[PDB]
Amino acid sequence: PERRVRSTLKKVFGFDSFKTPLQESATMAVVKGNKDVFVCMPTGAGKSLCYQLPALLAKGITIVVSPLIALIQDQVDHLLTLKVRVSSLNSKLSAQERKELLADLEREKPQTKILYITPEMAASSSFQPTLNSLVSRHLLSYLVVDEAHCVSQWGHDFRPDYLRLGALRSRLGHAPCVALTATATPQVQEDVFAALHLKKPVAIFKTPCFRANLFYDVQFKELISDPYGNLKDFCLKALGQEADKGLSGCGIVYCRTREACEQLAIELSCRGVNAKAYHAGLKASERTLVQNDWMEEKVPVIVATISFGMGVDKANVRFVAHWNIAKSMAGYYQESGRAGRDGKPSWCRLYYSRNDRDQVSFLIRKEVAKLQEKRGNKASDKATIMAFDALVTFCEELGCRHAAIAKYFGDALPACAKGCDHCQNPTAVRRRLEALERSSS
C-alpha cells in the first residue's frame, strides 16, 4: 500500500521520515502515476526524492532531463553511494563510455534503472532511435524534466531543445511526465503545461512564499518629516526584541545606487545605529572584512545596494529595509526573504517614492533599448518592465502584503494572523494611501 514507500524511504535513502509533509503528498501522486505532476519546491533538498523513490518502485526505466551536468553529477554520485543502478549521459563522460550505455538501453532488461540525460542529447537525431525502442518496449516508466522553467521565454534560462521535449511526451503516452523548478510565476507554470504538453489533471505541489514571522509594511518617502529618523527607529524597533536582552539580532538595508548606500550607513551610525556600507564599487578585501563584522554582530547592521548576493543568510536577521524600490517583485521577495531565517518575529519594510519609481522606470527603459539595438524586440523585454511594475503595484495598491506576493507567484491566499500593515490596521493603510493621492505631485 503506502507501507511500500515508507520502508523503501528508510531502507534505501536512510531517512526516518519525509523532510516535509508536502514532499510526502507530491511523491505519492508520482508513485500513483495516474497523473502528470508539477513540483515548484525550492533549493531545499525535497524535490529530487519526488522522482527518485518512485523510479525504483516503478519496475521500469526512469529518464531525468537536467539542463547542466553540474547538478546531475552531484546526485548520481550520492545515488550510487546508496547502492543504486543509476547512469548519467553527460558529454563530460567519454565517447567510449557513451557507446556502452547506448547499448545497455537497446538490450531488453537493461542494467540502467535511471538515465540522467541532458536536453541537448535528448533532442538530437543521434539519441532518437534508442529512445524509440525504450518506448515501444514499454521500458519507459517516468520522463522527468528538471528546471522546467527553461521551456518558457518568461523564465530566464529559456532552452528551445526543451520545446521538442513536448512532442516527446505525446509520443510516450504510456509513460507519465514529472516537471520540476525552484520558482515559477503562474505565467511560467501555464507555459510549462502547454509547451511540455502535460496531461490534465496535473497534480501540483508548490511551497507558499508567505512566512509566519515576517511582518511586511510599506512607508512613503514623500510623507516622512525625518526619513532617516524613521529608519533609525525601525532598526531599533526590529532589534532589541527583548528589553531585558538590550540589543538582540542583526539586519540589512538596500539601495539602488552605490553612493546612496554609503550615505545611509553614516546617517544611521551617527544616530547610534552602528552600521556599515557594502557594494561592487568596493575592493573585495573591504567586503569580506565588513561582512565578518556583521556576521559576528560586532556591527549589528549592514547596508548593501542591489548586490549582497545571499553570501550567507544568517539565523537572527530581525529586519530588512529597502530605502529604494528593488528592480523586480521577485527581487523584493528574495531580498526580504533573507530576513527571519530562524522563524522568530522579523520586519520587512519598503520606502516607496514616486521619485524612486520613475528613476528605475527610465533606468530599465534605457537598458532595455540598449538590448533592443543589441538583439531586437523580444518576449522577455516587456517581461522585465512587468516584473518591476508588480512591485510598484504592491506599494501603490492597498492589500495584505503576503497575498500580493502570493498572487504574483501563484500560491493561494495565506493566513496572515494580523501579520502585515493592511491586515493589522486596515485604516492606517487607507490613511497613508489617500495621503500619497495628495502628495502624488
Epitope: 501555464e190 490534465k200 501563484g410 493561494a412 491566499l413
Partner: nanobody
C-alpha cells in the same frame, strides 16, 4: 475537486429574456477560459460564448447581439444574459472550465478541465 453548477433557465416566448448563472465551488485560483455551450437536442453541440480570465470575451455569430457574458470577478461566477431569444436558442446550456488552476495553502493543487451539468432553456 471543483463543482461547476448551472442555474436560471426555464420557458419563455419568442423575443423574451433570461439570465444564466455558472458557479465554481472550491479552492480555485484562476480559470484560463470559461465557455457557454448549448446542447439543442436534434442538433450539433454549439459554442455560444466565452470569457478569458483577463476579461476578454467572444460570442458566436448567431447570438452576437442578443447574448452577453460577464464575471462578478469577486463572486467567482459568470452569467449569460440572453435577450431577443428565439425558438432556435431552445437547448440545455452548460459551461466548460478550461485551464482551471486550483490550489490550497498546504500548497497542494491541480490544473484540470471541469464541465457543468447544464440548465434547461425552452423558447416558444
Amino acid at each position: 475537486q471543483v463543482q461547476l453548477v448551472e442555474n436560471g433557465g426555464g420557458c419563455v416566448q419568442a423575443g423574451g429574456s433570461l439570465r444564466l448563472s455558472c458557479a465554481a465551488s472550491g479552492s480555485i485560483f484562476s480559470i484560463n477560459r470559461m465557455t457557454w455551450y448549448r446542447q439543442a437536442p436534434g442538433k450539433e453541440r454549439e459554442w455560444v460564448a466565452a470569457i478569458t480570465s483577463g476579461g476578454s470575451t467572444n460570442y458566436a455569430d448567431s447570438v452576437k447581439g442578443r447574448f452577453t457574458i460577464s464575471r462578478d470577478s469577486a463572486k467567482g461566477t459568470v452569467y449569460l444574459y440572453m435577450n431577443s431569444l428565439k425558438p432556435e436558442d431552445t437547448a440545455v446550456y452548460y459551461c466548460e472550465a478550461y485551464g482551471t488552476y486550483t490550489l490550497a495553502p498546504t500548497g497542494e493543487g491541480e490544473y484540470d478541465d471541469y464541465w457543468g451539468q447544464g440548465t434547461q432553456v425552452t423558447v416558444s
